[PDB]
């Protein structure tokens, strides 16, 4: 998570639709969620992850 290249252990947090899952469903400890969401978003821009299923 600390990075984005972690595409492997990253998609796990994001849903099928590419949408990042909250916490009441995960519990990735808020403090880390910050780095999580930021990492994912900035990553999708590198084609490492799809902005959404459709495209």
């Amino acid at each position: 998570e600390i990075d984005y290249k972690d595409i492997a252990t990253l998609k796990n947090y994001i849903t099928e639709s590419g949408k990042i899952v909250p916490s009441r469903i995960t519990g990735t400890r808020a403090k880390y969620q910050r780095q999580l969401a930021r990492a994912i978003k900035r990553a999708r821009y590198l084609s490492l992850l799809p902005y959404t299923d459709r495209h």
Binding site: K5, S47, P50
Partner: protein, 100 residues
């Protein structure tokens, strides 16, 4: 100076200049007394979403040390040079060697 972690995706159909390309970079850090404590040449890789045609690119890590001025030049040369599409250049992030 300062640490970095740039990442560019070169068109697969032009994956031949990728090697020579890295050179300019490696040199644009030599005389600048900078350093490259990383270099993950991901090479080819399927693209999640299509970026103006083509579902694959050529990823090449970086992580330099040279001052901002020089690295800035890379951003400019990256643009005009259509050999590479999307890019990204973050700062220090406390130098990271190998792995990733």
């Amino acid at each position: 100076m300062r640490h970095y972690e740039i990442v560019f995706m070169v068109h697969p159909d032009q994956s031949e200049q990728v090697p020579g390309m890295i050179e300019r970079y490696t040199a644009a850090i030599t005389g600048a007394e900078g350093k490259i404590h990383r270099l993950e040449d991901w090479g080819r890789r399927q693209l999640a979403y299509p970026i103006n045609k083509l579902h694959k690119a050529h990823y090449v890590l970086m992580n330099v040390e040279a001052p901002q001025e020089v690295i800035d030049e890379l951003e400019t040369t990256f643009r005009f040079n259509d050999a590479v599409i999307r890019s990204m250049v973050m700062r220090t992030k406390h130098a990271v060697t190998e792995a990733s």
